[PDB]
Amino acid sequence: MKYFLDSAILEEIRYAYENWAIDGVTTNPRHIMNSGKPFLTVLDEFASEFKGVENFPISVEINPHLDNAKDMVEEGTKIAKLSSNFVIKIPCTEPGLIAAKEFEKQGISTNVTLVFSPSQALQPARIGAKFVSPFVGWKENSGDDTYIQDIVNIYKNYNYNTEIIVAALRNGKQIVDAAKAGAHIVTCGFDVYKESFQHAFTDYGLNKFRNAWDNTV
Amino acid sequence: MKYFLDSAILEEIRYAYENWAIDGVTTNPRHIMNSGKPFLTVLDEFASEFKGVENFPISVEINPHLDNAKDMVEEGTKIAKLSSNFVIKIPCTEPGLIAAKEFEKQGISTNVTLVFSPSQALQPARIGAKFVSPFVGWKENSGDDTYIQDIVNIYKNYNYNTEIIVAALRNGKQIVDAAKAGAHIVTCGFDVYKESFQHAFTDYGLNKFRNAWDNTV
Amino acid sequence: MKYFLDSAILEEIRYAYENWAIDGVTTNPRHIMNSGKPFLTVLDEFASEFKGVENFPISVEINPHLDNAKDMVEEGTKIAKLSSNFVIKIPCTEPGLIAAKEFEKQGISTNVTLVFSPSQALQPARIGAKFVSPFVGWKENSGDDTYIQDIVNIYKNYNYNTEIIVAALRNGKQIVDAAKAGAHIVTCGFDVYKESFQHAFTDYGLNKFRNAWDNTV
Amino acid sequence: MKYFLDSAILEEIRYAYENWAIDGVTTNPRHIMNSGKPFLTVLDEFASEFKGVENFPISVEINPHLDNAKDMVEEGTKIAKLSSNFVIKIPCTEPGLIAAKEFEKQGISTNVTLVFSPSQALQPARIGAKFVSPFVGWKENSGDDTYIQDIVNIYKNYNYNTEIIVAALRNGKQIVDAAKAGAHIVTCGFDVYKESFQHAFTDYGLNKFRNAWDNTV
Amino acid sequence: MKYFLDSAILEEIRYAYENWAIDGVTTNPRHIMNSGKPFLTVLDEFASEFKGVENFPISVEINPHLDNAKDMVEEGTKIAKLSSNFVIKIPCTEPGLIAAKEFEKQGISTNVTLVFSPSQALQPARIGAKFVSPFVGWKENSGDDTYIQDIVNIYKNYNYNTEIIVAALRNGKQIVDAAKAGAHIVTCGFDVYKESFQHAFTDYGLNKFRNAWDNTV
Amino acid sequence: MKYFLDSAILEEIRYAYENWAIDGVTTNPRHIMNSGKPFLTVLDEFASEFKGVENFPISVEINPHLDNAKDMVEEGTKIAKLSSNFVIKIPCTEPGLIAAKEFEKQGISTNVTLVFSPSQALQPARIGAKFVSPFVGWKENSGDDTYIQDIVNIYKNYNYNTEIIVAALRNGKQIVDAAKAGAHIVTCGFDVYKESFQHAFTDYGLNKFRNAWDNTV
Amino acid sequence: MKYFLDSAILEEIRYAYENWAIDGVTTNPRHIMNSGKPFLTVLDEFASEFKGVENFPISVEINPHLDNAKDMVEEGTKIAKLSSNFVIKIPCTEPGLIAAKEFEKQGISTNVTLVFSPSQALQPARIGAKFVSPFVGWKENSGDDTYIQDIVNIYKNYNYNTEIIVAALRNGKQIVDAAKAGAHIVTCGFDVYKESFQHAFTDYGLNKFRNAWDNTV
Amino acid sequence: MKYFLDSAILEEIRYAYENWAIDGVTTNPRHIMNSGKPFLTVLDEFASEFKGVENFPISVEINPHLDNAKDMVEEGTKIAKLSSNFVIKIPCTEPGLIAAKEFEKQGISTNVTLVFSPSQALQPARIGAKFVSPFVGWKENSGDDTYIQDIVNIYKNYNYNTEIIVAALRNGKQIVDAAKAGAHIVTCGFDVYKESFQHAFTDYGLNKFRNAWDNTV
Numbered sequence A, B, C, D, E, F, G, H: 001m002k003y004f005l006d007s008a009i010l011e012e013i014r015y016a017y018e019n020w021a022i023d024g025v026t027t028n029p030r031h032i033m034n035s036g037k038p039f040l041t042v043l044d045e046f047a048s049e050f051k052g053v054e055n056f057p058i059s060v061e062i063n064p065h066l067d068n069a070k071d072m073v074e075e076g077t078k079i080a081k082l083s084s085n086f087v088i089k090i091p092c093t094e095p096g097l098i099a100a101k102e103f104e105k106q107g108i109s110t111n112v113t114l115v116f117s118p119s120q121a122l123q124p125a126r127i128g129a130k131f132v133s134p135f136v137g138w139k140e141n142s143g144d145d146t147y148i149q150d151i152v153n154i155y156k157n158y159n160y161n162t163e164i165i166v167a168a169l170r171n172g173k174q175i176v177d178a179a180k181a182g183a184h185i186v187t188c189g190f191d192v193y194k195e196s197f198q199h200a201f202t203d204y205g206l207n208k209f210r211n212a213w214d215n216t217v
């Protein structure tokens, strides 16, 4: 079970890597905007921070305005040449799935993102995408239930190597739901991971055990 | 999981093969009528388009007026001699199942089509048919629920090699249903496959990510 | 169980009313475009065709470009003054739900349309909308399963009078699904209703009964 | 729970009425052919046999070649004028459902027969048909499972008065299935009803009780 | 919930009536054989023991060799004239169900016994039998599962007044199964009822409570 | 999945073997009576018809009046010496199970027939019977549900080699039920197998495809 | 699946071994009391009857008054020295489980009996008991449902070698329940096994087949 | 299935090890307080009692006031140097999970305790903790249901080596629940284990068997 940090802040990426053993980092144009640093700067820092680190995937989304699979393959080839840890994140669109098939044929790892149905997840798997990111939070915010188990079951039934990254996770119960389904990776913000490791009953027992220790020689 | 294009139009067969990685093509007398070209012409084009292509099955239905298993075996032998990619499509009738058994004994791949029950699907499997096409859409149009899981389970329980091609699919949710069942192949029209790759929430997120990219250096 | 004809063609509305006993008619900007007649013309014809007919709701969508609840209430008040059978169809948006609450307070029947979740369906019910149209087909085309039972159950549990019109229906099995859920109305095109009344086994039995009648004095 | 005798033989109709308390009789063009008597003769006998008997419905199918709802309404009006116990049986076709609506409007009881889906059963219910006959045996002979519970549930959910007559029953377990569903009537041949009343364990116990009676004063 | 004593011994019938509040008594030719007294003697004793007792049904089976419904109605009329508490027990056979219908029409209460299927139970209910006795033990002895819930559900769905007497019960868990189903009456031997009222954990607690009482003033 | 023809008519056994690929033939004293030929004659014909054919089991029931396991072993040894394809069919009785154990010890294949419970099926499996025939139709005719899955599951859980032959099958849906359970063989009459291969929707599609072929060059 | 005869009568042990292929014999102080012979006599007979027979376990319970694990190990060592087929049966008590652990360490096979919960069954399995006998009948007589599946599942999940002997079985349906659960052995009285092999429908079919044989040359 | 004694009393640890075959011992600051001996004394006794014993884990919780992962690693390193059987028990806190990762990297076995959710259990598993103790009793005392199966399933799905120790167990039914889930170890007090081995029906049968033994030679 892999825990990828959904963050573009290197103070949180450094902490989670040294204390929580994160297995990777996913970013989106909104996480880079909230970074406050320019996109190319965030990339240079991520490339140096994990220069030697192997098996540490760093998903980086290309220009979201790209509408042609040829323009996406040219932009994502440049970003991928900046670090061997970088995985080009492409939206699940006609030209994104065409661009993700060309990328995977050239050996550039791709993360087909913005997948909201098991039918949108199967094509990324048929073209050999390294990762497929099915989003949960967004659909829930609009009163929809969250097809995650279907994707895991389909991927397994047809022996697909594509690794599922359940995204838009907002609480540790949604981490439990992804783990109970059999999802390969779960991407979450730093605070979702911290709170998931904490429980009120752990503080209750700690107080009961701290009272006992004191009433003991 | 194989995606066969249920079309007799070579502009859609060429596109789907180069961009969607279709694994085969299924046709019926109605798809050839809608082609606007004569049957033998459509066949010559399909034979040349995929002359060398291997592992690209092209299901072609014989004369639907054929009532004798001897007349079907003579007509389907001629069609099969036109290309090594051609798979003779035979209706699930007494003389069709007798003709499909003789064909399979002579090494001519057969696709027993128009199967609407798991009892009609088991005989094609007992005679070594290469493919069995259980239809879904038709029964649904007449208010019937769609036995697909039963066929998959029976085929698996008795280790049958016949590959199930769920046919008459009209939406990507019916593609999800076939994949969740464990069907080997799903045959669908070009537009059913395009829409199955698209979602409104992908366009919503794309707009949110395009706004962020713009408010970023 | 009400069967509303999802059509803007008066040859199909007249036939379905005299032969199928349709209980109402729903239209959308795309059905009026396919009519080939101007919007106001379609309305004048519908107003005269059912001038006296009572209990025959005719859902008519207002300008889809309207972005303010004040502009929607002014446009839908004018359309509603054209016939007592007309029910203003408003999209499930912030300004649509604000405009549907003002309309319902003035006694103008409203059909809150484009609802794709049970959370989007509950607010229309809390403001006293006459109808709420949850769409099925669209979500299915994008590989999503179709929350219809949840809306029926919620509406029932909280004794809401809003009538549910399952929309975007494409086959008679989806009519069976809405009826099995307990939906009040189902809106479908003329051809979806015709095919739903037909079955191959009815033609099989008819042939067996026609052979018997002939072999009988 | 009503038990209608699916027979055109008056020796079996007379016996079942006096010993099994049958509540009605259903006939089809094939049962009249097997009678060996002309159709009008069978009708005259049925009309006299139950001249006074009230609440004894006798379903009689009109010419199966009738293709127009006007020709069906003229033929079924004549048959209905032969006895007040006669219920015109009409096939679930476009012109049959149009003819069944006109018949029911004139007060002639109709039994919409050859219904093989819950979508084909709902229209007969919307037009006020007295009876709707969903067939089971035929679909089973072709390897299909038998939607009967759906029709019962739909009819109940929407408070329909149409009475469901499960037809083509071949064994007492299928009578148990219809009764467990809540079907109003079950139509079966004389032999299906006799065997349904018998069990091997009743003959076993009878032998054990006959041995005890003998070893007792 | 009624508890009928399945016994022909008046020492056990007297005890169960005064201490367990039995609501009735069922007997079969084998229980009368095991009585050791002649049939007519057992009847005279039962008639006097409960001469005035009202609402105390005493099921008495007629000659098990009777093969004609006319001979059964003559024999059961004589037995029924011996006491107003006597209920003629008739086997679920063609002539038994014909004889049970004639008996019920003359106002003689009948208990259609030896019923081993829900199809054999429905006819007794359609003819107004006072009681129907579905047997459990026999089928279980031959490795069959015991349709009891189906009969209860059918009887309830069709508002039948016939009271179900689950028979051949051998343990209190089978009494629990009949009560959980909703059966009206359960007939069991004296020892099945005694053991059903006892539990090892009641003797365990009694010992714990007897030790406490002793260690208390 | 094996399809054995439950017939004693060699015109139907020859056809089913050459066109349907039947894997064996089962017969009972009633099938031989309906043959119209003497028992020994039917056997001589079956022995010559399949003289060389290997792996073609021909189940033949011994004298049904045999009451001793010694008399059954002497009669079934004689019948088994008439052909190597013959499998002695013995009833599931005390002396039948004793005779089936002696037969199996001498290397004579036995088919323990007339099994109506999973407890009656387990003993045949413990003594190494080659086949066990659980009957379905009979129990259904008496309103009983049909323990078939239990036998399949028990046989599998305890790794038994005995092959289950679901018998008394009357429709292709009961063939689907046996295949869904995992039964090894299904024995059915010639007409049950023919109708199981046919569907009304296959004739509907055939007509739609025959109309298209005609409106095509 | 092993069938052990729960009897201390050697006429029934000899018959069941030669005709039913019993795999072992279980006895309790009550079965030896009902034998009418002294305990040591029953043991001498059982030791000689199966002197050479290998793999024929003969469970023999030690003095039920033994309260110390040391006294049980001394008494059960003596009984075990009388025959290599003897398996010391010890009650599931504190001193019984302590005595069963010492016995199993010395290589004396033990059958921890009187187990009525899955928690009482797990300890016998943790100490390497050869057999654990969970009782069913007793709990049922006191209206309790019968944890048997839990023990089978626990034993399997933790790869325990202890073989489960479902005891206190009273009918063949309880044999079916133990086999459906996956129990290793089932111990039952001679009559429970005989009746489990018999069915009324086997006698019905036998009569139908005996009538056919007679009406045949 | 391992049974660890949740006790700090060496009279109960010695007994359970020699008679119940306990596989380990877990202690908490409250068990050491109830010991009445100083913490270091309890440790010295446990270290000598099991000096040579291998594979006998002795979980010992560090100072519950420790708030830094550096202070926990220094205190738990000292305790671990006292015996090779000692396993440092650390609370599931941010600094506890950081301290448990450092400990496991240095080869010191750790038992991450006070886990009350499957999200708090997954991180201990990702850092290679030897044991994870999910608590049940506490949550139940506050009216919460007890996620134990989820942890077992997650651990299994992702092939984690961490062994689950279900803690705060209060009865043998909660031992059955942990065993039915597939938990590796269950830690319980001495009295929970004794009562789990006892049943009232074992004392009932013992009395029935003691009466029989007496009425026997």
Ligand SMILES: *[C@H](CO)[C@H](O)[C@H](O)[C@@H](O)CS(=O)(=O)O
Pocket: A006, A026, A027, A028, A030, A031, A059, A089, A111, A113, A114, A133, A137, A165, A167, A168, A169, A187
């Ligand atoms: C990439 C998917 O692999 C992104 O990081 C994703 O957008 C979302 O996970 C998060 S959020 O909605 O922006 O919070």
Ligand SMILES: *[C@H](CO)[C@H](O)[C@H](O)[C@@H](O)CS(=O)(=O)O
Pocket: B006, B026, B027, B028, B030, B031, B059, B089, B111, B113, B114, B133, B137, B165, B167, B168, B169, B187
């Ligand atoms: C062949 C089956 O393998 C055909 O292509 C099939 O008819 C249907 O898939 C499609 S449709 O109803 O004609 O659309």
Ligand SMILES: *[C@H](CO)[C@H](O)[C@H](O)[C@@H](O)CS(=O)(=O)O
Pocket: C006, C026, C027, C028, C030, C031, C059, C089, C111, C113, C114, C133, C137, C165, C167, C168, C169, C187
């Ligand atoms: C109104 C809803 O009440 C409309 O008629 C609706 O848009 C859809 O039902 C149909 S479609 O997708 O345009 O076919």
Ligand SMILES: *[C@H](CO)[C@H](O)[C@H](O)[C@@H](O)CS(=O)(=O)O
Pocket: D006, D026, D027, D028, D030, D031, D059, D089, D111, D113, D114, D133, D137, D165, D167, D168, D169, D187
């Ligand atoms: C009328 C329906 O109400 C008929 O009697 C019906 O056809 C079938 O019930 C019977 S069969 O297939 O002809 O046996």
Ligand SMILES: *[C@H](CO)[C@H](O)[C@H](O)[C@@H](O)CS(=O)(=O)O
Pocket: E006, E026, E027, E028, E030, E031, E059, E089, E111, E113, E114, E133, E137, E165, E167, E168, E169, E187
């Ligand atoms: C009457 C049914 O109402 C009888 O008493 C019945 O036979 C059985 O209940 C009992 S037994 O098998 O004879 O024990």
Ligand SMILES: *[C@H](CO)[C@H](O)[C@H](O)[C@@H](O)CS(=O)(=O)O
Pocket: F006, F026, F027, F028, F030, F031, F059, F089, F111, F113, F114, F133, F137, F165, F167, F168, F169, F187
């Ligand atoms: C043998 C079983 O293996 C027989 O052929 C069997 O009796 C039945 O299958 C058929 S029927 O009831 O006689 O139709």
Ligand SMILES: *[C@H](CO)[C@H](O)[C@H](O)[C@@H](O)CS(=O)(=O)O
Pocket: G006, G026, G027, G028, G030, G031, G059, G089, G111, G113, G114, G133, G137, G165, G167, G168, G169, G187
């Ligand atoms: C031994 C268990 O392995 C005995 O034989 C057991 O007591 C019971 O099986 C039977 S009964 O209750 O005494 O009938």
Ligand SMILES: *[C@H](CO)[C@H](O)[C@H](O)[C@@H](O)CS(=O)(=O)O
Pocket: H006, H026, H027, H028, H030, H031, H059, H089, H111, H113, H114, H133, H137, H165, H167, H168, H169, H187
């Ligand atoms: C250690 C967990 O592995 C402890 O022994 C634990 O606290 C609890 O099991 C018990 S109690 O609540 O203190 O009884």
